[PDB]
Scaffold this motif. Structure first.
Motif, PDB file in Angstrom:
ATOM      1  N   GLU A 347     -64.112  47.157 -18.308  1.00 47.85           N
ATOM      2  CA  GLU A 347     -65.016  47.194 -19.460  1.00 47.85           C
ATOM      3  C   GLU A 347     -64.265  47.631 -20.697  1.00 47.85           C
ATOM      4  OE1 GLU A 347     -68.287  46.296 -19.375  1.00 47.85           O
ATOM      5  OE2 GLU A 347     -68.331  46.082 -17.189  1.00 47.85           O
ATOM      6  N   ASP A 349     -63.954  50.007 -22.921  1.00 49.30           N
ATOM      7  CA  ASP A 349     -64.339  51.392 -23.120  1.00 49.30           C
ATOM      8  C   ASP A 349     -63.158  52.308 -23.462  1.00 49.30           C
ATOM      9  OD1 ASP A 349     -63.096  51.561 -20.705  1.00 49.30           O
ATOM     10  OD2 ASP A 349     -64.897  52.059 -19.547  1.00 49.30           O
ATOM     11  N   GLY A 350     -61.996  51.722 -23.748  1.00 44.42           N
ATOM     12  CA  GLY A 350     -60.811  52.506 -24.055  1.00 44.42           C
ATOM     13  C   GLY A 350     -60.293  53.372 -22.918  1.00 44.42           C
ATOM     14  N   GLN A 351     -60.665  53.039 -21.686  1.00 42.45           N
ATOM     15  CA  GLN A 351     -60.311  53.832 -20.517  1.00 42.45           C
ATOM     16  C   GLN A 351     -59.969  52.912 -19.351  1.00 42.45           C
ATOM     17  OE1 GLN A 351     -64.084  55.729 -19.943  1.00 42.45           O
ATOM     18  NE2 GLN A 351     -63.566  57.525 -21.172  1.00 42.45           N
ATOM     19  N   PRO A 352     -59.263  53.430 -18.345  1.00 43.86           N
ATOM     20  CA  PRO A 352     -59.032  52.650 -17.116  1.00 43.86           C
ATOM     21  C   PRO A 352     -60.167  52.828 -16.110  1.00 43.86           C
ATOM     22  CG  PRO A 352     -57.828  54.696 -17.010  1.00 43.86           C
ATOM     23  CD  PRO A 352     -58.481  54.687 -18.353  1.00 43.86           C
ATOM     24  N   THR A 353     -61.354  53.131 -16.615  1.00 46.15           N
ATOM     25  CA  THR A 353     -62.489  53.491 -15.769  1.00 46.15           C
ATOM     26  C   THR A 353     -62.846  52.363 -14.792  1.00 46.15           C
ATOM     27  OG1 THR A 353     -63.323  54.968 -17.509  1.00 46.15           O
ATOM     28  CG2 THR A 353     -64.888  54.282 -15.801  1.00 46.15           C
ATOM     29  N   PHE A 355     -60.896  51.205 -12.365  1.00 47.76           N
ATOM     30  CA  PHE A 355     -59.695  50.636 -11.788  1.00 47.76           C
ATOM     31  C   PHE A 355     -59.163  51.509 -10.648  1.00 47.76           C
ATOM     32  CE2 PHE A 355     -60.133  48.575 -15.771  1.00 47.76           C
ATOM     33  CZ  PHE A 355     -59.275  47.488 -15.850  1.00 47.76           C
ATOM     34  N   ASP A 502     -57.005  48.918 -20.008  1.00 44.26           N
ATOM     35  CA  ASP A 502     -58.390  49.102 -20.460  1.00 44.26           C
ATOM     36  C   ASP A 502     -59.263  47.997 -19.874  1.00 44.26           C
ATOM     37  OD1 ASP A 502     -60.755  49.662 -21.869  1.00 44.26           O
ATOM     38  OD2 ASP A 502     -59.950  49.294 -23.843  1.00 44.26           O
ATOM     39  N   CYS A 503     -58.913  46.754 -20.172  1.00 45.40           N
ATOM     40  CA  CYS A 503     -59.725  45.621 -19.794  1.00 45.40           C
ATOM     41  C   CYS A 503     -58.881  44.361 -19.936  1.00 45.40           C
ATOM     42  CB  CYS A 503     -60.950  45.552 -20.707  1.00 45.40           C
ATOM     43  SG  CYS A 503     -62.070  44.183 -20.395  1.00 45.40           S
TER      44      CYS A 503
HETATM   45 CA   LIG Z   1     -61.783  49.935 -19.632  1.00 51.68          CA
END
Ligand SMILES: [Ca+2]
Length: 508
Positions: A347, A349-353, A355, A502-503
């Motif tokens: 997504e 969202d500026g994160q590797p959330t 993954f 990030d995405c």
């Molecule tokens: Ca992301």
């Protein structure tokens, strides 16, 4: 009794708190050299609690104003303040600088008894390095078979109002409601605590070179408050407005501040939204409500860059001016634009959330046996789960990442492959091949000159790399994308050039 006891070597400050809190300040160095809470010494005996590794020598004064006592410690470019209020077991502090300390970071460290205060809150023993053997620099360790670091105590500053060390009879917390003079924005994180084997350290890193994206800010840092409890846990609602009456260098009171208020709109409503204001003097932020409404903290007057994020991904930027005693009404709006999506991994969202290894990486080293395999991995769109896509690619660990996807005949026109990242190391950036088409090699990103992915961090400059894919390069049926990390630099394993994802989105 509430008061100051003066000797040739020290001021002893007695807060007159119900469960007792007295502490000793050296008149030569400004070190805190003794802390007595509920009849018990908490200060590490061989080294003080202080700014940095100690001011060394300072000019120290102590004065009572009504129900307040102020200790001031002056050095050439830094003045340190300690303030107490009669009846409260709290050492309030603020730190005024006219230059960055020579070490290139600004921190306060309380070095406290680790037999009495063995534990670290809220993340627990992931930052306990006692009995550890170094595996990276002098700051990441193996304790048994578990990786550990002071850095794994870290938290996004927007979410870090309280962190503590504790045992079964005492607790000491930092309460942090004023990050305006820090650097790196709301998503900067830093070392909070470390039980290292001789003592348990409780910190506030006002600024540092740990994945630093901004210049340092001068002036008054804080206030910050160090709260001493028996077994209670203090609220983060701690009034420090009395600093206004104590002639604190750099202190700007409520009356000297204004605000910005408005509504943010347009972004992905499934994400948290943040609005962020900054200039060379100060930085501020707030979450918005679900409706997008926001009111800034009380801000120093001036003109600010204003950023609207979904997660940590910036969707809009503007400018706004604040004047004392007034609220500037200012809305902001924007959204992430791509196009007609063929596939999307993650997504914006500026994160590797989401993954592989992302959650683990905040609290352990990539070499930890508890990490899932880094790869090389092959992610097949429509079959693989997001937790099969690596949160980062390292030139010499899991290079390259391969993506397989199916396209229909209606999807063989021109396209853009967008590779969004969060943070690079040692010049790492992506070069993509799509079937038999090879994208250009992007230039090296700005070097932040800091470890990050190995130390629980991911917030970098958020570089995004687009690759233009000509019509007829995508084919009906199976397609292959290879993402290689390129760099002229080299390193061993997780210190090889790398970046955090990030995405990844392919759209038309
Ligand atoms: Ca992301």
């Amino acid at each position: 009794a509430f008061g100051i006891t003066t000797s040739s070597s020290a001021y002893v400050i007695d807060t007159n708190a119900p469960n007792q809190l007295k502490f000793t300040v050296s008149r030569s160095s400004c070190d805190i050299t003794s802390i007595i809470h509920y009849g018990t010494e908490l200060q590490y005996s061989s080294q003080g609690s202080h700014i940095g590794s100690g001011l060394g020598s300072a000019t120290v004064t102590a004065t009572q104003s009504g129900d307040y006592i102020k200790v001031t410690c002056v050095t050439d470019t830094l003045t340190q303040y300690m303030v107490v209020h009669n009846g409260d077991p709290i050492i309030h502090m603020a730190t005024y600088i006219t230059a960055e300390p020579s070490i290139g970071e600004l921190r306060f460290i309380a070095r406290l008894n680790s037999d009495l205060l063995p534990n670290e809150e809220p993340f627990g023993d992931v930052s306990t390095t006692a009995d550890g053997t170094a595996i990276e620099g002098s700051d990441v360790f193996l304790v048994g078979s578990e990786t550990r670091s002071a850095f794994y105590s870290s938290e996004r500053f927007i979410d870090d109002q309280r962190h503590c060390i504790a045992g079964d009879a005492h607790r000491v917390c930092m309460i942090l409601n004023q990050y305006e003079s820090s650097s790196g924005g709301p998503f900067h994180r830093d070392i909070n605590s470390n039980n290292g084997g001789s003592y348990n350290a409780l910190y506030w890193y006002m600024n540092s070179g740990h994945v630093q994206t901004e210049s340092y800010r001068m002036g008054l840092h804080g206030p910050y408050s160090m709260y001493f409890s028996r077994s209670g846990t203090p609220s983060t609602s701690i009034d420090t407005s009395f600093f206004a009456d104590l002639d604190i260098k750099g202190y700007v009171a409520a009356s000297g501040r204004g605000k910005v208020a408005g509504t943010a709109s347009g972004a992905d409503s499934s994400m948290d939204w943040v609005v962020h204001w900054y200039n060379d003097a100060a930085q501020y932020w707030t979450y918005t409500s679900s409706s997008g409404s926001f009111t800034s903290p009380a801000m120093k007057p001036g003109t600010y860059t204003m950023v609207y994020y979904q997660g940590e991904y910036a969707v809009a930027t503007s400018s706004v001016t604040v004047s004392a005693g007034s609220t500037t009404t200012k809305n902001i709006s924007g959204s992430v634009k791509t196009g007609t999506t063929i596939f999307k991994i993650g997504e914006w969202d500026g994160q590797p959330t989401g993954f592989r290894n992302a959650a683990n990486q905040l609290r352990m080293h990539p070499s930890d046996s508890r990490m899932s395999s880094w790869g090389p991995l092959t992610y097949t769109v429509g079959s693989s789960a997001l937790t099969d896509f690596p949160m980062a690619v390292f030139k010499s660990v899991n290079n390259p990442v391969t993506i397989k996807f199916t396209a229909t005949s209606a999807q063989t026109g021109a396209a853009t492959l967008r590779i969004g990242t969060t943070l690079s190391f040692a010049g790492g950036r992506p070069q993509a091949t799509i079937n038999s088409y090879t994208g250009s090699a992007p230039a090296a990103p700005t070097n932040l000159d800091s470890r990050g992915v190995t130390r629980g961090a991911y917030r970098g400059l958020g570089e995004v790399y687009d690759v233009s894919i000509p019509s007829g390069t995508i084919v009906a049926g199976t397609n292959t994308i290879t993402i290689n990390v390129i760099s002229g630099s080299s390193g061993d394993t997780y210190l090889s050039p790398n970046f955090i994802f990030d995405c990844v989105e392919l759209f038309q």
